[PDB]
């Protein structure tokens, strides 16, 4: 359901291209009219993933980097919602890959946590900083690790994301993988540089927060 108080934002959300075209034909300014959250038709089109509508808006020359009241840009919205083709179009029209919202998150953070593989590759090929830290000092790798997104970790590693960045609690992605008992993800991380010796702010290493026999599994890998 769409919460926008604007008719035009609702048209964009429900994918009514023709009706939207008529509205905007009747009043050009509607293309960039902001609702109660400073979202325009573009934000809402990205959310619902209506590619043709985004394409139309873009060719009208609407701004593509304006943030809503929560700091979310169209790219943030498209990446989170998993809108492959829209992300591609946005990046093609100069969307800022490293834009942050009020939480300090880039579009990559959401791609990574939500397991948007194609979008992640797009963002990273587009120059996204893999080590970008949000206001919790967490990286995309933290998200991928916690959720147990193996493929996403491989992607991030190919683009040279660090495995040992500590968040605000002092946890590395390995701490998170171990706590959620994400076994294969934890092995991968270790096999590619993640330290089993780094302590969080409770002075625990990733082995000490590991559940099941995961601690010993990782200890073996490193220490035999």
């Amino acid at each position: 359901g769409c919460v926008s108080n604007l008719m035009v934002c609702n048209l964009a959300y429900s994918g009514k291209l023709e009706e939207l075209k008529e509205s905007i034909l009747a009043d050009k300014s509607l293309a960039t009219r902001t609702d109660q959250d400073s979202r325009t038709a573009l934000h809402w089109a990205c959310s619902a993933g209506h590619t043709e509508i985004v394409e139309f808006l873009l060719q009208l020359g609407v701004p593509v980097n304006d943030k809503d009241d929560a700091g979310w840009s169209p790219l943030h919205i498209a990446a989170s919602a998993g809108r492959d083709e829209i992300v591609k179009a946005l990046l093609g029209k100069g969307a800022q890959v490293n834009a942050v919202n009020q939480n300090g998150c880039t579009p990559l953070h959401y791609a990574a946590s939500k397991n948007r593989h194609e979008i992640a590759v797009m963002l990273l090929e587009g120059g996204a900083n893999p080590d970008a830290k949000d206001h919790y000092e967490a990286t995309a790798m933290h998200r991928a690790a916690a959720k147990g997104n193996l493929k996403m970790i491989h992607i991030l590693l190919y683009y040279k994301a660090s495995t040992n960045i500590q968040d605000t609690e002092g946890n590395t992605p390995l701490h998170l993988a171990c706590d959620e008992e994400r076994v294969e993800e934890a092995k991968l991380l270790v096999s590619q540089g993640a330290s089993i010796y780094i302590e969080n702010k409770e002075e625990k290493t990733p082995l000490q927060v590991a559940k099941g026999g995961l601690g010993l599994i990782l200890k073996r890998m490193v220490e035999g």
Partner: single-chain antibody
Amino acid sequence: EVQLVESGGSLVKPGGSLRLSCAASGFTFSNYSMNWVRQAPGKGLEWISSISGSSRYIYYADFVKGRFTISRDNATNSLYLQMNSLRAEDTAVYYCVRGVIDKFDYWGRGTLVTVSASQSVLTQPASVSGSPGQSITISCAGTSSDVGGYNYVSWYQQHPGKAPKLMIYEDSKRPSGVSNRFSGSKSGNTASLTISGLQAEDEADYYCISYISSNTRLFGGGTKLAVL
């Protein structure tokens, strides 16, 4: 339609130095990681080098050791490979390949390099006798360093003189446009491709590739599938 055309493949005396080129079209070249993969006669698919869209990230297989250098020009949609000091073990068909991680989705017809003048790390069966309509399985075996639960095996199909096709990647996932008669799985240090209801068009060569990291792609020696 996506097209990759390799050129520059010739015969050259050992010690010589070649330069391969690839003309790309049918997609946004600049947005894609590109690769060079070579295949010696009878041998498997050996990944050589990859380069990111922006040229920021470049990787080489261990054997390269400075002898090869990949480059690209997004402006003119072309990929290059500078090969120095050509040994005889370099004799192969060199393919230009689009893809990242384990997903090598587009290959060119390849260009042949001949140097005029020790098995594969992963182990496949040489031959597989199939009977139309039945069901067969090709195995890909390695050590615990080669095939694991936290990395991927991919399967590639190849007909005589044709661009290799990606059948399976990520152990078990298959690209759109590929028949569901093809499936893959893995147990311990061994991956298995399976085909059900064999065709005669299914008769071909099959190769496995274990993706370990950005600079490590292990390969099997190939498996000839004969459809009776």
